[PDB]
């Protein structure tokens, strides 16, 4: 569509494209550096995009867009969190749940996206 590259799905991509915090390929920000070949976003934007597509009434377009975005190999987002110590559950090559050292200050880190 105009925003994803018919109306409800298009509006999900619009909002996602206006994410306030993005990091281009090779960009350094927040003490991180994006080593992927495409832009990565804050996890809250990716979270809201995922939920928007899942709840969209244009269910067929949303299904294609969600799968395309989220199920690409090695997809990640960043956010501020206590230092990550491990993964509690992995499925299909993705961390579902992680653990942290709650006693150390929060720092920006990288997190797996969920499969759609």
């Amino acid at each position, epitope marked *: 569509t105009l925003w994803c590259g018919f109306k409800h799905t298009d509006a999900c991509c619009r909002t996602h494209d206006m994410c306030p915090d993005v990091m281009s390929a090779g960009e350094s920000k927040h003490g991180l550096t994006n080593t992927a070949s495409h832009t990565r976003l804050s996890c809250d934007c*990716d979270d809201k995009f995922y939920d928007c597509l899942k709840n969209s009434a244009d269910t067929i377009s949303s299904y294609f867009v969600g799968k395309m975005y989220f199920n690409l190999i090695d997809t990640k*987002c960043y956010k501020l969190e206590h230092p990550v110590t491990g993964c509690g559950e992995r499925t299909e090559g993705r961390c*579902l749940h992680y653990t942290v050292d*709650k006693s150390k200050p929060k720092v920006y880190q990288w997190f797996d996206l969920r499969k759609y």
Partner: nanobody
Amino acid sequence: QVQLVESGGGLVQAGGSLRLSCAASGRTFSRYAMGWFRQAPGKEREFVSAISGSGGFTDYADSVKGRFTISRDNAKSTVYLRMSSLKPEDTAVYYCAAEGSRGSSTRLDARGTYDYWGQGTQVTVSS
């Protein structure tokens, strides 16, 4: 549209046991982690235990490890907290919580992971 219905609280003597249950409707139960939190009088709400959608991963607050056991039955859309060797300091309102829809990995002992909360069930442990 999801609703959480808790039960199993009550007034028990110290050393005793209870089993809380929380049944959840409105979406596919097995896709989401479920957690238990508690709030004692005058204290902040705190994490107690949580379990992943598959049941394969569980987490417990340090003060309840070895005494409490969380489990879930995805065919009944229900999560359980078996509470043994109860202490006076376990007195609190216990709240079931259901993980929000998210597009990235989540931490089970963070309150922000959960978007839906039960009204709670009172557990009082007397000595």
